Subunit: 228 residues, 3 copies
Amino acid sequence: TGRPEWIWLALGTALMGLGTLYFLVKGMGVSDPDAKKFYAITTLVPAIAFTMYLSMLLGYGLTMVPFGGEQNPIYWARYADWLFTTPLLLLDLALLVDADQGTILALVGADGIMIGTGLVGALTKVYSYRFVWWAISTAAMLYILYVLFFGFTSKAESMRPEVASTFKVLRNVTVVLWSAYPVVWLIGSEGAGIVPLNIETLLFMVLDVSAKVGFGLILLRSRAIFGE
Amino acid sequence: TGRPEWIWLALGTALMGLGTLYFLVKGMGVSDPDAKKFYAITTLVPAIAFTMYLSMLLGYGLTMVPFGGEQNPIYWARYADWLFTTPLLLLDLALLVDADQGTILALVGADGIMIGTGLVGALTKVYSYRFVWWAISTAAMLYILYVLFFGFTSKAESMRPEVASTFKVLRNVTVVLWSAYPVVWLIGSEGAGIVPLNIETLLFMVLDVSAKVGFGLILLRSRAIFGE
Amino acid sequence: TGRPEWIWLALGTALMGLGTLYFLVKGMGVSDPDAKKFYAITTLVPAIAFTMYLSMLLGYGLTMVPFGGEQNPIYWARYADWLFTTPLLLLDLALLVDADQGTILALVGADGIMIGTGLVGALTKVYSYRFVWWAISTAAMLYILYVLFFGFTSKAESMRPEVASTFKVLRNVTVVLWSAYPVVWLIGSEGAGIVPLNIETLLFMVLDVSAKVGFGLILLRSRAIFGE
Ligand SMILES: CC(C)CCC[C@@H](C)CCC[C@@H](C)CCC[C@@H](C)CCOC[C@@H](CO)OCC[C@H](C)CCC[C@H](C)CCC[C@H](C)CCCC(C)C
Ligand SMILES: CC(C)CCC[C@@H](C)CCC[C@@H](C)CCC[C@@H](C)CCOC[C@@H](CO)OCC[C@H](C)CCC[C@H](C)CCC[C@H](C)CCCC(C)C
Ligand SMILES: CC(C)CCC[C@@H](C)CCC[C@@H](C)CCC[C@@H](C)CCOC[C@@H](CO)OCC[C@H](C)CCC[C@H](C)CCC[C@H](C)CCCC(C)C
Ligand SMILES: CC(C)CCC[C@@H](C)CCC[C@@H](C)CCC[C@@H](C)CCOC[C@@H](CO)OCC[C@H](C)CCC[C@H](C)CCC[C@H](C)CCCC(C)C
Ligand SMILES: CC(C)CCC[C@@H](C)CCC[C@@H](C)CCC[C@@H](C)CCOC[C@@H](CO)OCC[C@H](C)CCC[C@H](C)CCC[C@H](C)CCCC(C)C
Ligand SMILES: CC(C)CCC[C@@H](C)CCC[C@@H](C)CCC[C@@H](C)CCOC[C@@H](CO)OCC[C@H](C)CCC[C@H](C)CCC[C@H](C)CCCC(C)C
Ligand SMILES: *C/C=C(C)/C=C/C=C(C)/C=C/C1=C(C)CCCC1(C)C
Ligand SMILES: *C/C=C(C)/C=C/C=C(C)/C=C/C1=C(C)CCCC1(C)C
Ligand SMILES: *C/C=C(C)/C=C/C=C(C)/C=C/C1=C(C)CCCC1(C)C
């Protein structure tokens, strides 16, 4: 493994794998149907990331994109991961607050646009246009963060204190960690090329494990996930 | 931009972009959960088309398919657009009439078959077989149009007059505009090659903007989208 | 058709096509909304398989994957089929028993992991790593079979005798036929290469037609699909 970023791909694979097994074991026995939804969503998220980390580690999830005069290593498997795991994370938030279905559809669809335009930007061979896709994807992310802070103002007169409390923490966790991903992309291998791929891969590893396994530990340890 | 169809890709990009912003602004403030569903579906549709028009304009959504002795320019991004936006359009219709879930699943699944076989036909290198996929996809479209006219005969004893009225108009808009897409494909660059790609791109632009932004203006201006 | 497996691809195409038309005709007239769900799911399943069998027959769904020193014919279209039809089959089971939504999401997501890791294994160029993906996919299949036997223990105090009976038979049909697919893959063209592709294609044809058209005949002939 002649790619120096292999260690972070291996560590990411192991930590997503271990978080999947932990959440699997923890959700055994659970009969509350509301809690079963949260365990299924929250366990699927690092299970999908485990498979995509492994595909990067083994090289399957890596391709070379010509741009800027250069053959650029691009890990496309990250977008196949995020396509599914970032709407699932939004679904955990949305279920906490009993979101209306129109709000869930706005969130999941804005998130698909965010990930799909991120992927088009990652694979685009004209260097300047990569950053046009980055901006569109960021605009979709900002929409999602707007909805998470301002789209549930009908949900407060009626929201169990423990649901509000856990939703607040997870929403803060989300806004901080997810906002770092466009920055990493912009300065890393896919963007300006200021931070080398080895470091980029480290940064996404720490973000992903926090946003998936850290997030899910907070959620699944709360009694907000059970019907009262 | 040495592709003469660039002007229609640019115009399509702008009109889908402007229709997205208009519907975004128009749906601000809306609290009625039924109306929020219609705004989310109807706003996502031109937002997705904006991204796919832009990918065609920038060249990312174009590939060359050998067939007929020739390297043929094929805009595959149209199928990535339609994969999502044509079930969303069907969902707006189906929600208007309070469709049963089995009818929604038939519609969304027939539509996936329509778009996916359209894409296989667009990328098929044996010329005669392209038209086998065209026929299968047309058969799926005809099924969808059948369901839209004859699959909601339990929904009339109970259907607000304004819902019936808006559903009738949008269903007519749909049947007329969607039926033109197999014809354009059959005579255009993907099919018989009778109409040049520049004109084909113009035709799909006018159809798409009408079927997305025209459709959505009719829907979102009606009080059929609000619970009574 | 210089591929000896063409006959089984042609036969599979015809049998999925004929089963689609039969289920289409059989579900005409059905007004019971619960029954309409089962007809839509169960009819879409062989309709999707018909398109994917046809794409294999015509060669579109075939690619060459280098591994083991060799250019290996890999029918990738099977994974595009299964991506949709295996969650749909699980949905028919889950609706029979009135599964909780968290259980449905676990099933559909485990199934996506099963098919997507199966596809990564089928396309992986390092021979030994193909079998790592096979094992992960098998682990997801075993999870699905676990849930089908042990995830509905809240659903028995309340389950119409005819629903229990039909669910039991279809679940047995599923466990036996689906468990054969990793074995065929492991000994066939995608794995160890012990069984030639011609025979492999025969085996998957018999499995698919049984698991789709055989399964659906059992389901759609039962009164378990109607609300009582
Ligand atoms: C609910 C159910 C009932 C639904 C039923 C399913 C229904 C659709 C029936 C099955 C049809 C279909 C799924 C199967 C055909 C797959 C098709 C894409 C195959 C083409 O790809 C094969 C290759 C190489 O030979 O061609 C070359 C590849 C091309 C150059 C690429 C062109 C294709 C586009 C890239 C498609 C874009 C779609 C994206 C995957 C959408 C998400 C991506 C995003 C978030 C960035
Ligand atoms: C000029 C540029 C270089 C800067 C780029 C910024 C840009 C990308 C936008 C990001 C802003 C965003 C992170 C802020 C949103 C979170 C927070 C401020 C929201 C406040 O509201 C929530 C409150 C109360 O419930 O809790 C508060 C929740 C938390 C306690 C808020 C704490 C914020 C985080 C601690 C900051 C993230 C830390 C990084 C992940 C560390 C990486 C840096 C590295 C080089 C060591
Ligand atoms: C709800 C959630 C819990 C679900 C969890 C997600 C779960 C599936 C886990 C993730 C696995 C998976 C999504 C990730 C792997 C992606 C896989 C397709 C990668 C293969 O493609 C990489 C390339 C180049 O190196 O190979 C060469 C490319 C090949 C030649 C092409 C073969 C692949 C097929 C084309 C696949 C067909 C699927 C279609 C996109 C379906 C729709 C298309 C249609 C409508 C026309
Ligand atoms: C032989 C071939 C060349 C012809 C190909 C036809 C074939 C592809 C099938 C298409 C038929 C389809 C469009 C008809 C369905 C719509 C309509 C007749 C349905 C009637 O029922 C609805 C009624 C009452 O509510 O309103 C009625 C709704 C509307 C008022 C109906 C009006 C029909 C449209 C005005 C026709 C479409 C116009 C084109 C988009 C213009 C493009 C032509 C260009 C060259 C100028
Ligand atoms: C609900 C709605 C509102 C949602 C709105 C949709 C929203 C996402 C907006 C549309 C964006 C997007 C869908 C369109 C862009 C498609 C994008 C994949 C195009 C890239 O592919 C083009 C090629 C050749 O030029 O590049 C080369 C190809 C690369 C080498 C491959 C890299 C891409 C990955 C393979 C993507 C993996 C995703 C898988 C299809 C997931 C399932 C596969 C699995 C089960 C094995
Ligand atoms: C060492 C290896 C080579 C063996 C590999 C096995 C491995 C892949 C795991 C598979 C085990 C699995 C098929 C068993 C599950 C089914 C069954 C035993 C479950 C019992 O519980 C259900 C009961 C009561 O309702 O009905 C019972 C339901 C049925 C009546 C059970 C009958 C089992 C099937 C008849 C066996 C499958 C037959 C094959 C499809 C035939 C192909 C062989 C060919 C070479 C002729
Ligand atoms: C599980 C992994 C998580 C939570 C990942 C989140 C990823 C994003 C918020 C990605 C955002 C991006 C942009 C806004 C701009 C373009 C680059 C992306 C895709 C990295
Ligand atoms: C937003 C864009 C809309 C409403 C597009 C609709 C597209 C169709 C109805 C496409 C149909 C096709 C056929 C029936 C045959 C094969 C060619 C297609 C995909 C163009
Ligand atoms: C309609 C076709 C059906 C029911 C197909 C089922 C396919 C599976 C159960 C496939 C399973 C696989 C594994 C568990 C290991 C990797 C190889 C696969 C994808 C064939």
